[PDB]
């Protein structure tokens, strides 16, 4: 109470501010006041007076010189909380008081259980992974970071970036797999989260890939395939994108695929497919099967008569399918199937491979050879053709049925039959036990119809009688034994007319060697009793002049007649034996010669025909254009070798729409060709020409390329649809692109004519191709003109389009 006009009541200059601080740690509540006299400061938490170290030297709080309340260590418990509250500093003197603002001191907090614990994540290498986390509640609010396997991880990246609660890695690798914890700190401390693991699976990868293999039929083959990935991928096989037709395939545990028995049909592109959670991956390999060519049917020799038709079969199997082609021994020319010739030759080859010659000439006779040639090898077989004329040789006369063993009583009259055939027609003669008959005795005489007649029988006439047919073509004989006794004409089996089984099937040749020929025939049976066995007669212009037996008592219908003269032609005849006697003779066999087949042999090697076709140099001259739709191409050969089917000539478009694309293919199927005319091509356009000599599936080397363009033709249809804008005086011209084919060449220019109301003034403007729309210059005022656009070419004169007699106005307007 010492008044002075220098003394002023107290003013708090520095106010204490709210603070959160941790237990057991120092802190200072800031306070600073002005006064005169200087004031005494004292603090109040909620209401009560704060006991500093002045009020008791045992206390932990301390009022500073400044006035700030400084705690040494903050004190806090569960029940007694002495420092947690709402502080205010109060400075006073005799003039008055001064209470500060509120400042609350709060003890720091940090719970255990997280608001959101990071959860396990599964990703595929290269993909982004997002881990999220939310720390426990705290005061202050906590802030998080991430540990990988108890190692801090920095966002010092563009792939790694921590944002809010979220952590993300992009382009994940297996480096990133492991335990991830999210750690939330504070000024209390830090709590770790439940660990979330990141698994980084990857797509399947090939360790051992299957490799292409080439293998001969019926062998065994396998393709290996080893994979890797996370998770472990499952392997499966497919062929040509289809599943493997069950059978010879076998899937091993190590995933190897084994084909036990290889087959032309097993060929293809096999592929190994690996698949897990992340997706799939496939790698293929090819299998190729080599089947060397082999004859299914091979041609055998034929003896056939002039003017007929011959067919030599040649069927051929292999891989690739072999191409059949023929050649006449001692002749350079070859014959190929689909190839046509002029309607003047009679040779011709089936797609099957069968060779056929119509209307045979003596000229055609000789050996022929069908040949097969692939990369898998080569084969051939030759067969002989023998042609026969009007009657190069006629067969010797034939006795159908001769006399049978008659047995007649004395004094009677005996007739003996004998049935002949042949060309020329035969003379029938007789013999008795060998000598001439009838000789001297008048009682016996020779009949025309083969029968021999004896009036007035006697004992003296019993014997062996022989019927002999004779022409210029040979002679055959048939003898029987006659018996003449007094009584003996005992009715054992009287005379037979047509009781005898009728002829059998004309004998069909099967196999033939040098001393064998196998025959086939079927029964006949137009007769009486059943046949027991067979008897084969035969003939040869060489070995004999008459018909001989070559096997008797044959109990089959497919017999091999053994032991014959080699390189000899033979004809045959079959008969049936039965108790009644013998059958009539079957018709003659078809001529056959005794030779051993020329067994299949190896042809020329594929490499060596390749080598020949390679060295062939086709010189092309220069394409000569016929019309703008036609070019005749002419080449020449250095030296044409034996093995060549023809020339394959190829051209490509190198102008306008779709240039330098594929080649148009058309080939000359006849090797002696030297010229070819192309069809339906584009006028004006330039084309590149290549000539290649080709064999079968085989191909030679290309000739020097020539390029030549078609002669150019003016268009057939111009662009239409003429539009006229209004000026504001001068007419306008506008058109739509004219058609591609109707262009008839490369567009040159565009000509506009204006022969309108003025028939002694026509406007002429000559632009270029690129031009689309243009306005006309010097136009006569008022006068109504006509507009006629034209497409043009390098020919010149184009084609007029849609006329437009549009009405024009005056000057600088259209009225």
Ligand X SMILES: *[C@@H]1O[C@H](CO)[C@@H](O[C@@H]2O[C@H](CO)[C@@H](O[C@@H]3O[C@H](CO[C@H]4O[C@H](CO)[C@@H](O)[C@H](O)[C@@H]4O)[C@@H](O)[C@H](O[C@H]4O[C@H](CO)[C@@H](O)[C@H](O)[C@@H]4O)[C@@H]3O)[C@H](O)[C@H]2NC(C)=O)[C@H](O)[C@H]1NC(C)=O
Which residues of this chain interact with ligand X, rule CB under 6 A?
Answer: 405, 480-481, 532-533, 553, 577
Three-state SS at 46: coil
The rounded distance, in Å, linking the Cα atoms of 814 and 806 is 11
Instruction: Name the token pair of 230.
Output: 């996370």
Residue 577 beta carbon to ligand X: minimum distance, rounded to whole angstroms: 5
Residue 489 beta carbon to ligand X: minimum distance, rounded to whole angstroms: 17
Q: Which of 62, 481 has the CB closer to ligand X? A: 481
Q: Which of 399, 714 has the CB closer to ligand X? A: 399
Residues 8, 35: contact at Cβ < 8 Å?
A: yes
Pick from 19, 106, 24: nearest CA to 68: 19
Q: Which of 515, 578 has the CB closer to ligand X? A: 578
Residue 405 beta carbon to ligand X: minimum distance, rounded to whole angstroms: 4
Residue 608: phi and psi, rounded to 5, are: -85, -20
Residue 470 beta carbon to ligand X: minimum distance, rounded to whole angstroms: 21
Three-state SS at 727: coil
Residue 336 beta carbon to ligand X: minimum distance, rounded to whole angstroms: 54
- Quote the DSSP letter at residue 266: G
Q: Which of 125, 554 has the CB closer to ligand X? A: 554
Residue 494 beta carbon to ligand X: minimum distance, rounded to whole angstroms: 16
Q: Which of 481, 708 has the CB closer to ligand X? A: 481
CA distances from residue 76 to 23, 73, 297 in whole angstroms, order as listed? 6, 10, 113
Sign of CA dihedral 657, 662, 668, 672: positive
Count CA atoms within 13 Å of residue 413 on its CB side: 5
Residues 229, 241: contact at Cβ < 8 Å?
A: no
Residue 514 beta carbon to ligand X: minimum distance, rounded to whole angstroms: 28
Residues 411, 485: contact at Cβ < 8 Å?
A: no
Residues 452, 446: contact at Cβ < 8 Å?
A: yes
Residue 613: phi and psi, rounded to 5, are: -70, -30
Q: Which of 90, 561 has the CB closer to ligand X? A: 561
- Tell me the pairing of strands 166-169 and 129-132: antiparallel
Three-state SS at 701: coil
Residue 579 beta carbon to ligand X: minimum distance, rounded to whole angstroms: 8
Residue 353 beta carbon to ligand X: minimum distance, rounded to whole angstroms: 45
Q: Which residues contact 659 (CB under 8 A, 6 or more apart)?
A: 653
Q: Which of 547, 635 has the CB closer to ligand X? A: 547
Residues 262, 217: contact at Cβ < 8 Å?
A: yes
Residue 555 beta carbon to ligand X: minimum distance, rounded to whole angstroms: 7
Q: Which of 10, 503 has the CB closer to ligand X? A: 503
> By beta-carbon distance, which residue lies closest to ligand X?
405
Q: Which of 96, 530 has the CB closer to ligand X? A: 530
End-to-end CA distance of the chain: 114
Residue 493 beta carbon to ligand X: minimum distance, rounded to whole angstroms: 12
Pick from 699, 698, 647: nearest CA to 375: 698
Residue 502 beta carbon to ligand X: minimum distance, rounded to whole angstroms: 18
The rounded distance, in Å, linking the Cα atoms of 523 and 503 is 8
Residue 480 beta carbon to ligand X: minimum distance, rounded to whole angstroms: 6
Instruction: Name the token pair of 323.
Output: 């191409």
Pick from 608, 646, 638, 606: nearest CA to 620: 638
Q: Which of 478, 643 has the CB closer to ligand X? A: 478
Residue 549 beta carbon to ligand X: minimum distance, rounded to whole angstroms: 10
Q: Which of 121, 554 has the CB closer to ligand X? A: 554
Bridge partners (DSSP) of residue 679 are 630
Instruction: Name the token pair of 628.
Output: 């703008």
Q: Which of 247, 463 has the CB closer to ligand X? A: 463
Q: Which of 88, 398 has the CB closer to ligand X? A: 398
Q: Which of 22, 477 has the CB closer to ligand X? A: 477
Pick from 350, 349, 354: nearest CA to 333: 349
- Quote the DSSP letter at residue 682: P
Q: Which of 132, 483 has the CB closer to ligand X? A: 483
The rounded distance, in Å, linking the Cα atoms of 490 and 473 is 41
Pick from 791, 759, 757: nearest CA to 772: 791
Instruction: Name the token pair of 448.
Output: 């025309």
Q: What is the DSSP string of 2-33?
A: ---TT-EEEEEEEPP--EEE-TTS-EEE--EE
Residue 481 beta carbon to ligand X: minimum distance, rounded to whole angstroms: 5
The rounded distance, in Å, linking the Cα atoms of 24 and 189 is 13
Q: Cα 734–735–740 angle (5° rounding)?
A: 160
Q: Which of 409, 480 has the CB closer to ligand X? A: 480
The rounded distance, in Å, linking the Cα atoms of 381 and 376 is 17
Pick from 287, 353, 351, 290: nearest CA to 319: 290
Three-state SS at 606: helix
Q: Which residues of 64-77 are buried (b: 16+ CB within 10 A; e: fewer)?
A: eeebbbbbeebbbe
Residue 402 beta carbon to ligand X: minimum distance, rounded to whole angstroms: 9
Please name the residue that has the structure tokens 């990935």.
229
Q: Which residues contact 197 (CB under 8 A, 6 or more apart)?
A: 120, 177, 178, 179, 180
Residue 264 beta carbon to ligand X: minimum distance, rounded to whole angstroms: 50
Q: Which of 89, 535 has the CB closer to ligand X? A: 535
Three-state SS at 607: helix
Residue 581 beta carbon to ligand X: minimum distance, rounded to whole angstroms: 7
The rounded distance, in Å, linking the Cα atoms of 443 and 425 is 28
Q: Which of 577, 691 has the CB closer to ligand X? A: 577
């Amino acid at each position: 109470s010492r008044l002075r006009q220098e003394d002023f009541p107290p003013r708090i200059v520095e106010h204490p501010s709210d603070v959160i601080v941790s237990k057991g740690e120092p802190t200072t509540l800031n306070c600073k006041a002005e006064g005169r006299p200087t004031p005494t400061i004292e603090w109040y938490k909620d209401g009560e007076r704060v006991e500093t170290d002045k009020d008791d030297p045992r206390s932990h709080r301390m009022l500073l010189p400044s006035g700030s309340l400084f705690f040494l260590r903050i004190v806090h418990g569960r029940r007694s909380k002495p420092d947690e509250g709402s502080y205010v500093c109060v400075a006073r003197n005799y003039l008055g008081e001064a209470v500060s603002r509120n400042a609350s001191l709060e003890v720091a907090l940090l719970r255990d259980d997280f608001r959101q614990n990071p959860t396990d994540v599964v990703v595929a290498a290269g993909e982004p992974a997002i881990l999220e986390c939310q720390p426990p509640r705290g005061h202050p609010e906590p802030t998080i970071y991430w540990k990988k396997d108890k190692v801090r991880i920095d966002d010092k990246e563009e792939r790694i970036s921590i944002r809010g609660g979220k952590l993300m890695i992009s382009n994940t690798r297996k480096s990133d797999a492991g335990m991830y914890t999210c750690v939330g700190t504070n000024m209390v401390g830090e709590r770790d989260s439940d660990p979330a693991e990141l698994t980084v699976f990857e797509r399947p990868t090939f360790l051992r890939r299957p490799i292409n293999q080439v293998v001969l039929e019926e062998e065994a083959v396998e393709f290996r395939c080893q994979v890797q990935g996370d998770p472990q991928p499952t392997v499966r096989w497919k062929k040509d994108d289809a599943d493997l037709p069950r059978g010879r395939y076998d899937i091993k545990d190590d995933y190897t695929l084994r084909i036990k028995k290889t087959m032309s049909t097993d060929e293809g592109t096999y592929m190994c497919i690996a698949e897990n959670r992340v997706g799939k991956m496939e790698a293929s390999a090819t299998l190729t099967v080599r089947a060397p060519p082999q004859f299914v049917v091979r041609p055998r020799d034929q003896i056939v008569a002039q003017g007929r038709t011959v067919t030599f079969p040649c069927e051929t199997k292999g891989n690739p399918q072999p191409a059949v082609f023929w050649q006449k021994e001692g002749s350079q020319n070859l014959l190929f199937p689909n190839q046509p010739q002029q309607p003047n030759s009679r040779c011709s080859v089936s797609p099957t491979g069968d060779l056929t010659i119509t209307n045979i000439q003596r000229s055609d006779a000789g050996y022929y050879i069908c040949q097969a040639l692939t990369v898998a090898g080569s084969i051939l077989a030759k067969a002989q053709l023998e042609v026969t004329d009007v009657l190069t040789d006629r067969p010797p006369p034939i006795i159908l049925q001769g006399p049978a063993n008659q047995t007649l009583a004395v004094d009677g009259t005996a007739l003996l039959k004998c049935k002949a055939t042949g060309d020329p027609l035969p003379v029938i003669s007789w013999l008795k036990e060998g000598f001439t008959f009838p000789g001297r005795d008048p009682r016996a005489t020779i009949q025309e119809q083969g029968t021999l007649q004896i009036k007035n029988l006697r004992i003296s006439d019993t014997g062996t009688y022989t019927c002999v047919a004779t022409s210029s073509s040979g002679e055959t004989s048939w003898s029987a034994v006659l018996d003449v006794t007094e009584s003996g004409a005992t009715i054992s089996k009287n005379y037979d007319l047509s009781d005898l089984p009728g002829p059998p099937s004309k004998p069909q040749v099967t196999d033939v060697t040098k001393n064998s020929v196998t025959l086939s025939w079927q029964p006949g049976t137009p007769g009486t009793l059943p046949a027991s066995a067979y008897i084969i007669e035969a003939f040869s212009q060489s070995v004999s002049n008459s018909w001989q037996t070559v096997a008797n008592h044959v109990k089959t219908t497919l017999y091999t007649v053994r032991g014959l003269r080699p390189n000899t032609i033979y004809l045959f005849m079959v008969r049936a034996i039965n108790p009644q006697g013998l059958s009539d003779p079957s018709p003659m066999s078809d001529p056959v010669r005794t030779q051993d087949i020329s067994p299949p042999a190896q042809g020329v090697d594929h490499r060596q025909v390749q080598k020949e076709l390679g060295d062939v140099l086709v010189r092309l001259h220069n394409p000569v254009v016929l019309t703008p739709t036609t070019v005749q191409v002419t080449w020449t050969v250095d030296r044409q070798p034996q093995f060549i089917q023809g020339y394959r000539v190829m051209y490509r478009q190198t102008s306008g729409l779709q240039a330098t694309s594929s080649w148009q293919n058309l080939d000359a199927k006849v090797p002696t060709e030297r010229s070819a005319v192309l069809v339906n091509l584009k006028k004006g356009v330039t084309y590149e020409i290549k000539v290649r000599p080709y064999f079968n599936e085989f191909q030679g080397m290309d000739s020097e390329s020539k390029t030549v363009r078609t002669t150019e033709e003016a268009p057939s249809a111009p662009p239409q649809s003429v539009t006229v804008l209004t000026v504001g005086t001068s007419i306008s011209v506008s058109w739509d692109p004219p058609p591609p084919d109707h262009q008839n060449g490369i567009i040159q220019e565009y000509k506009i004519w204006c022969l309108g109301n003025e028939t002694r003034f026509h406007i002429n403007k000559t632009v270029d191709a690129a031009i689309r729309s243009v306005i006309i210059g010097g136009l006569f005022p008022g006068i109504q003109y006509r507009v006629e656009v034209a497409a043009s070419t390098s020919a010149g004169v184009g084609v007029k389009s849609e006329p437009q007699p549009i009405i024009i106005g005056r000057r600088n307007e259209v009225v």
